[PDB]
Amino acid sequence: PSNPTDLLAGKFTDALSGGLLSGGLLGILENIPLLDVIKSSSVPLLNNILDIKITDPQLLELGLVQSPDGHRLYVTIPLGLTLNVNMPVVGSLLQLAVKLNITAEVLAVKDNQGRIHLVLGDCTHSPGSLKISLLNGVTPVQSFLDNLTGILTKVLPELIQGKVCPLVNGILSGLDVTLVHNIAELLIHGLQFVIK
Ligand code: NA
Ligand code: NA
Ligand code: NA
Ligand code: NA
Ligand code: NA
Ligand code: NA
Ligand code: NA
Ligand code: NA
Ligand code: NA
Ligand code: NA
Ligand code: NA
């Protein structure tokens, strides 16, 4: 397998992605109170929205890049989900496919007792990775309900990142101490291991 550090990236992305699902990521996404965050010239639109249900939450394969000085990792956490908008004037259940990436920077740091840990630094959604598309068959939608997509663009990334970033932090603190130690030693000495 040499060089065995080649495997660390995959192990890290496995443990993190596993941690996310073990920690209830999908249900957490499903239970965001989107229509209430949005409620509490839009009053018409908003008044014609019976409810919103979030279904088919998805975690995609994680991306990982190591910084050029070797001290930091950047994890790309790609998410998908479907918004089910009950809006009767529309004639049908309105479905929106959502995509969003969260970027989490991972750092190594030693504690007051000398123990080394992986910790979350910056954590925030990736500019321009939010995608909201109305599911209408093989024919795309143009200029229908742009206001709804606009409000969603304003609220949805922030809700999602406010749920996902704390979850990532907790997972980091609970990782396998052996994996933590090996990766953190690499990071703290600025040593490259993630293959681009
Ligand atoms: Na090896
Ligand atoms: Na690796
Ligand atoms: Na390597
Ligand atoms: Na894998
Ligand atoms: Na749901
Ligand atoms: Na599902
Ligand atoms: Na750098
Ligand atoms: Na309606
Ligand atoms: Na639809
Ligand atoms: Na951001
Ligand atoms: Na995207």
Side-chain angles (χ1 to χ4, degrees), residues 1-35 37-38 40 43-46 48-49 51-52 54-89 91-109 111 114 116-137 140-141 143-146 148-195:
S2 185
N3 185 359
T5 60
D6 295 337
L7 303 177
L8 294 179
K11 291 185 176 183
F12 183 70
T13 52
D14 292 343
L16 186 54
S17 64
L20 288 174
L21 298 185
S22 294
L25 174 64
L26 301 185
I28 293 166
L29 293 175
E30 289 169 349
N31 287 314
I32 290 167
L34 182 57
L35 177 153
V37 175
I38 276 170
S40 61
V43 285
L45 184 62
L46 277 301
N48 291 113
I49 291 169
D51 67 355
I52 298 170
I54 298 167
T55 65
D56 298 330
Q58 194 173 356
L59 179 64
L60 286 67
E61 190 180 16
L62 299 188
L64 187 66
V65 303
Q66 189 171 5
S67 67
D69 68 1
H71 287 91
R72 295 178 302 283
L73 298 174
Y74 292 96
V75 184
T76 296
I77 301 171
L79 300 172
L81 60 79
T82 298
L83 300 178
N84 294 295
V85 177
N86 187 358
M87 186 177 188
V89 61
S92 58
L93 182 62
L94 183 62
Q95 279 178 342
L96 292 76
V98 175
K99 286 182 178 289
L100 181 66
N101 298 336
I102 308 301
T103 302
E105 77 168 348
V106 177
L107 303 167
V109 303
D111 66 3
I116 200 165
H117 299 85
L118 294 177
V119 300
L120 183 65
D122 196 9
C123 187
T124 192
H125 71 280
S126 305
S129 70
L130 178 65
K131 272 72 183 299
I132 301 167
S133 60
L134 284 73
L135 295 180
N136 193 9
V141 176
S143 295
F144 185 78
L145 298 178
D146 282 337
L148 178 61
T149 300
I151 182 66
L152 290 175
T153 298
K154 299 304 181 184
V155 304
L156 192 57
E158 293 81 10
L159 291 170
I160 291 171
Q161 72 190 7
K163 298 292 183 185
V164 170
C165 291
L167 184 61
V168 173
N169 202 172
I171 296 167
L172 287 175
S173 72
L175 290 176
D176 182 4
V177 315
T178 299
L179 181 65
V180 169
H181 185 273
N182 296 325
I183 292 170
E185 290 303 336
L186 294 171
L187 293 180
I188 206 162
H189 298 295
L191 296 174
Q192 297 291 321
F193 61 157
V194 176
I195 303 302

